[PDB]
């Protein structure tokens, strides 16, 4: 129930690159564990986004 | 791997021009903003540059002499430097956001 | 302008000790949006550029030894070396990077 909250986070991220964003989705979908570091990899890449 | 490139070493004479390159590798170049920093023989930040549209925004001590640019078809920024003085002299670095730092390159106005 | 006030300038080290520094902001670096505290330390070696150890205030960069840990949040940020070695005599500084003006700390220079 924590998973799927990333999910929708990382779904409704504001101005993601579509294929980092359907990376860190896949990711998510292969592996429903390490949730907190794919939205890591989010976060970090969204406070570079221009 | 993330990295980031800049041009040689600098010798000027007082109110002449330099040009800094800062070729990059390794990410989408047109996702992150590239941002410049002075570094004093303290850290003074001077601005970036958007990537994807090319539009720079400069610091408040910083809106006078400098113009930041790209060329995107080989990932490069540039710094323009105009009416070069003694306190010019410096280290600058290009910088991938708070990420990763370029090699920097140093300046000597004399 | 958010103003970044660091620790002292200079710290002298006994090999093996732990050494802290600090790193107080004017105002929040504390993003609503991510829950992620916009502040990242940095160390610089003599004539080498920055590279950095910590991001998101309390988070590891990879490749970084364990024994450098920040934490802090909102205004108050440290970056603590639990066992100080001879490989880490450089300089070290925090960066703001929550508004557009980026503001540095000062500087902590790591000798004997």
């Known amino acids: 129930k924590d998973q799927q909250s990333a999910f929708y986070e990382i779904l409704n991220m504001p101005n993601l690159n579509e294929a980092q964003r359907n990376g860190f989705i896949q990711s998510l979908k292969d592996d429903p564990s390490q949730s907190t570091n794919v939205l890591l990899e989010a976060d970090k890449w969204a406070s570079l986004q221009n | 791997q993330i990295q980031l490139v800049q041009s040689g070493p600098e010798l000027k004479k007082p109110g002449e021009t330099v040009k800094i390159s800062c070729k990059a590798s390794?990410?989408?170049?047109?996702?992150?903003?590239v941002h410049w920093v002075k570094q004093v023989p303290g850290l003074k930040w001077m601005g970036w540059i958007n990537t994807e549209t090319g539009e720079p925004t400069y610091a408040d001590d910083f809106k006078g002499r400098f113009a930041f640019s790209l060329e995107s078809s080989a990932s490069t920024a540039y710094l323009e430097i105009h009416n070069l003085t003694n306190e010019d002299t410096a280290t600058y670095f290009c910088?991938?956001?708070?990420?990763?730092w370029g090699l920097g390159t140093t300046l000597t106005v004399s | 302008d958010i103003q970044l006030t660091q620790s002292p300038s200079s710290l002298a080290m006994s090999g093996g000790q732990k050494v802290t520094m600090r790193c107080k902001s004017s105002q929040s670096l504390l993003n609503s949006r991510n829950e992620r505290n916009y502040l990242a330390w940095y160390q610089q070696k003599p004539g080498q550029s920055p590279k950095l150890l910590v991001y998101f205030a309390s988070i590891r960069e990879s490749g970084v030894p364990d024994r450098f840990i920040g934490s802090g949040s909102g205004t108050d940020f440290t970056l603590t070396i639990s066992s100080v070695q001879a490989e880490d005599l450089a300089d070290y500084f925090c960066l703001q990077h929550y508004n557009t003006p980026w503001t540095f700390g000062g500087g902590t220079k790591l000798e004997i």
């Open positions: 390794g990410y989408t170049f047109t996702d992150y903003s």
């Open positions: 910088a991938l956001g708070w990420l990763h």
